């Protein structure tokens, strides 16, 4: 690395076999690949680390402690049943997390880091893993580096240092070799280009690069727990502590009654295992993993887990105009000169193929000096280049070059050679270079400048009319302004071009009409999302009329809408900015600092924002948003790294689905919480009243363990898996607090638990009317509680819908788990060893039917009160 850094580029190409302008032939590519290897360094453990990582959840430690407490008093079946419950919950958590991580890696593999490399001397699009040492690669603005790059030419190259060094300080690269951001001659793995263009050969790939150890370290860190995950860890711990208090009160009431110490210790350990939500963090992890799985199915790369839950709370979606709502395909269509003569331009694309026609006949070369001067100001000025009908740099600069190569003025791009340049910045809104003719070296250098029309007409001094140069006046500014407004209101992006001998001595030449089509599928999407209670906006760097027209064609702009500029948005303080910002749907002439200020102004109001943008201007605002979204086909790698979400199919129907699934996660969680809490309170109050009543306890410790498997295992994880509904999608977005245990939900939980307890007490007292103690009554109440539990599970399947209107075919896992619990209960009734270990004997068919109806009662009452609430809503 350093030895090649102090080595000259010619000596570098002498040490390693390469051609400087023609790249490597594919035979030599395969020859270097057979020895050096691929770009991926070795391999990136699920069998051992991922399975053992689930056992450090605190509720899992406490259930393991209860199991080893049961081991200390040596009952085998209690300990193995607690361990079976623990094994099942960590198994489903591990398999869902593993599947989500594998699908995430598959989708991140599906998009490759693309490279613009000249393998055969022509511009080709290759991947990062296809690169071999010796290949020379062109670097674009906002491109991640393909390999360890040694650059032979660099007119203007800028390399960030935040990837490895961790510093946000800007850094530049020097073409001349340096003896001995350590060395600016050699480009580093992991960095990205923030500005400018350069070309360079590569010295090594894969393991042989020094900077692979930083990537090895960055893979080591685990994903931190989401605020939802910590919140429901708190909820599970507080439910555990409330159940512990209730069970301790039961044990004291039990001690006074004097019931056997060992049997009540088993019943209390069983009740503690049951009522604790061992499956609450596992069901939260299952919901998040399934949400990531759906995002992969919706073609979205989600880097971190909290994005899946913050998309459900989203109520404002900001965006950009080019690259997000318009496809960032730019082409010059109309030319208006400073003379007043107008030209219309032919063709679509970044092509050399088009016609420019004035007054009814075509113009080319140096036929008319105004349009030729405008076109020439559109080739030398652009840093970007067009090679083999492919766009390399930014899409607007290419449009003018496409126009420059349309009119027949390609070679002046090369003839002119620049010395010092003024780079384009989003805050600066203007571009400028001074270059000198190759053939006419005696002629002095002259500056060319392209930028926002207001800044351009501010900077230049004079104008051109009738082929003559005259000083700019106010009426000339007025005619140029009305013309610019006409281009903007027609829907044509405006670039104003001017030329002059020196900066500040420039002269205005005219305008170019750049059109960009709206991205297909955005208008119906934005209509749907606005109909779903979100407020999608438009943050733009372009003019008022362009952004307003594009928002109108897209339907973003109402008939009475307010649009605020950048100077006005930095004029207002934050509170009245927050007041005026929901009315605004079009922001324009906004710098990235303005975009960050809009994002923060909506963030102060409690509104969860989701910036969907593309650009290299400043991706810190994408980190400032609650959700960072970037596009895949036309998306620069800096905003892809900064994004919290990447969509590769580039339709606004997916960000729409992300909010839908983030909403449905909480509904599935509500189903789990309702079901488990209702049966936990039912069993707890059952044991509390009977132990207090002096009656024999209706359920045994093994029976409460089987009830725990029902209440926390796959019958409850099924309710955490249940697919979303379209009607609960149409509900407006919720606040940041989850607000899960609502008053209606707690009322429903108490109603279901009260019906379960009353039915169990009725059957228990009915079998105790003859005042004898037999296992018949305790298996009667065990079967009654188990059937009540599956009926309360079926009642918990949908919060706002009736149990019949949804259907059992929606959730296959619920049907499988219900059938499994029914068959396990019937084996407890029928199998004589299971009869001995559960203190159970067989029952009759009519008794089972009577229990089935008595437990259907809670489902009937549940659908009655849900229909009553729905009719009250109507």
């Amino acid at each position, epitope marked *: 690395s350093k030895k090649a850094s102090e080595l000259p580029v010619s000596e570098v190409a002498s040490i390693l076999q390469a051609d400087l302008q023609n790249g490597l032939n594919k035979c030599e590519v395969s020859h270097r690949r057979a020895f050096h290897g691929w770009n991926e360094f070795d391999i990136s453990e699920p069998l051992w680390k991922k399975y053992i990582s689930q056992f450090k959840n605190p509720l899992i430690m406490l259930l393991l402690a209860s199991a080893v407490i049961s081991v200390l008093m040596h009952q085998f079946d209690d300990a193995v049943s607690i361990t079976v419950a623990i094994l099942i919950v960590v198994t489903v958590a591990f398999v869902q997390e593993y599947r989500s991580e594998k699908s995430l890696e598959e989708l991140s593999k599906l998009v490759p880091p693309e490279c613009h490399c000249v393998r055969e001397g022509k511009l080709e699009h290759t991947l990062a893993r296809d690169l071999v040492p010796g290949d020379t690669v062109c670097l674009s603005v906002g491109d991640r580096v393909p390999a360890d790059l040694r650059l032979f030419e660099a007119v203007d190259l800028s390399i960030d240092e935040s990837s490895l060094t961790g510093e946000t300080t800007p850094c530049s690269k020097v073409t001349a070799p340096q003896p001995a951001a350590s060395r600016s001659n050699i480009a580093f793995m992991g960095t990205l280009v923030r500005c400018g263009k350069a070309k360079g050969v590569v010295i090594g790939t894969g393991e042989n690069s020094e900077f692979g150890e930083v990537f090895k370290m960055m893979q080591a860190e685990e994903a931190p727990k989401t605020p939802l995950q910590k919140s429901m860890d708190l909820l599970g711990k507080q439910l555990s502590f409330y159940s512990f208090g209730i069970i301790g009160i039961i044990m004291l009431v039990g001690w006074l009654l004097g019931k056997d110490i060992l049997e009540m210790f088993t019943i209390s350990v069983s009740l503690a295992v049951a009522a604790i939500p061992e499956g609450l963090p596992i069901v939260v992890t299952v919901t998040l993993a399934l949400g990531v799985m759906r995002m992969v199915k919706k073609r979205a790369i989600v880097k971190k887990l909290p994005i899946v839950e913050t998309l459900g709370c989203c109520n404002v979606i900001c965006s950009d105009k080019t690259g997000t709502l318009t496809k960032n395909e730019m082409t010059v269509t109309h030319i208006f000169t400073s003379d007043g003569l107008h030209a*219309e331009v*032919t063709g*679509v*694309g970044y092509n050399q193929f088009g*016609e420019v*026609i004035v007054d009814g006949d075509v113009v080319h070369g140096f036929y008319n000096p105004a349009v030729s001067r405008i076109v020439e100001a559109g080739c030398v000025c652009n840093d970007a280049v067009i090679r083999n*009908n492919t766009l390399m740099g930014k899409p607007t600069e290419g449009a003018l070059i496409a126009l420059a190569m349309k009119m027949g003025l390609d070679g002046l791009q090369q003839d002119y050679i620049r010395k010092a340049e003024y780079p384009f910045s989003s805050e600066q809104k203007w571009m400028a270079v001074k270059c000198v003719h190759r053939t006419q070296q005696d002629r002095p250098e002259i500056c060319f400048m392209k930028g926002a029309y207001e800044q351009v007409i501010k900077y230049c001094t004079t104008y051109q009319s009738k082929g003559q140069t005259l000083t700019l006046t106010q009426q000339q500014r007025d005619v140029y302004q009305q013309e610019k407004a006409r281009m903007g209101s*027609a829907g044509l992006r405006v670039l104003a071009l001017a030329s002059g001998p020196e900066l500040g001595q420039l002269t205005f030449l005219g305008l170019v*009409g750049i059109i960009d089509p709206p991205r297909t599928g955005v208008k119906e999407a934005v209509t749907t999302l606005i109909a779903s209670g979100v407020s999608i906006k438009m943050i733009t760097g372009d003019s008022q009329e362009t952004a307003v027209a594009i928002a109108s064609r897209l339907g973003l702009y109402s008939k009475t809408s307010q649009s605020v500029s950048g100077e006005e948005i930095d004029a207002m303080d934050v509170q009245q900015l927050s007041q005026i910002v929901p009315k605004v749907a079009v922001f324009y002439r906004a710098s990235p600092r303005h975009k960050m200020k809009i994002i923060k102004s909506l963030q102060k109001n409690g509104s969860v924002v989701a910036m969907t943008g593309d650009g290299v201007n400043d991706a810190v605002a994408l980190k400032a948003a609650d959700i960072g979204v970037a596009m895949g086909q036309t998306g620069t790698d800096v905003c892809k790294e900064a994004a919290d979400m990447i969509l590769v199919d580039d339709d606004f129907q997916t960000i729409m689905s992300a909010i839908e699934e983030g909403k449905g996660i909480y509904n599935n969680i509500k189903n789990f919480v309702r079901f488990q809490l209702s049966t936990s309170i039912a069993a707890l109050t059952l044991i509390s009243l009977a132990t207090l009543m002096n009656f024999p306890n209706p359920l045994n410790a093994m029976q409460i363990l089987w009830i725990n498997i029902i209440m926390d295992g796959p019958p409850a994880q099924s309710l955490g898996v249940e697919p979303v509904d379209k009607d609960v999608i149409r509900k407006p977005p919720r606040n940041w607090k989850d607000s899960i245990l609502t008053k209606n939900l707690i009322l429903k939980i108490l109603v279901s638990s009260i019906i379960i307890v009353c039915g169990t007490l009725f059957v228990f007292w009915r079998e105790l009317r003859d005042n004898v103690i037999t296992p018949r009554d305790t298996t009667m109440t065990f079967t009654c509680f188990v059937f009540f539990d599956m009926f309360n599970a079926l009642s918990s399947r949908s919060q706002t819908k009736s149990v019949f209107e949804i259907g059992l075919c929606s959730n296959r896992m619920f049907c499988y788990a219900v059938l499994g619990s029914i068959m396990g209960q019937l084996l407890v009734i029928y199998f004589p060893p299971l009869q001995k270990v559960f203190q159970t004997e067989s029952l009759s068919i009519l008794d089972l039917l009577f229990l089935l109806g008595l437990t259907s009662s809670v489902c009937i009452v549940a659908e009655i009160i849900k229909k009553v609430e729905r009719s009250r809503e109507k």
Partner: nanobody
Amino acid sequence: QVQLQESGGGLVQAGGSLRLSCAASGSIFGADWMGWYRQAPGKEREFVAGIGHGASTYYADSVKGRFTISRDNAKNTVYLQMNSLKPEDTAVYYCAVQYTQYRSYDSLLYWGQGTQVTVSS
């Protein structure tokens, strides 16, 4: 307005011969440019045939000579003749016809839906 429907198109192997045909409902003598634009599967859009007001037929660099254009006025259906295309040169072939507007800065460029050409085997 011009509504564009493409006829005689569909995927063909490398080395084959076929005649494209694009039907335009509107006039051609008032139009500025009758053009054919390619859209490669997975890549950007270029063109394959184009004739404008200046009577200069445009042939792309990949298909110079072997892709040819012919058209008349009354039939309102411009053709495109291609010979021996390449697998990298496959595309969904669009249609584009616009008029000459300087009062109205309107997008008179209308695209057709086109037809897809891809070489795999």
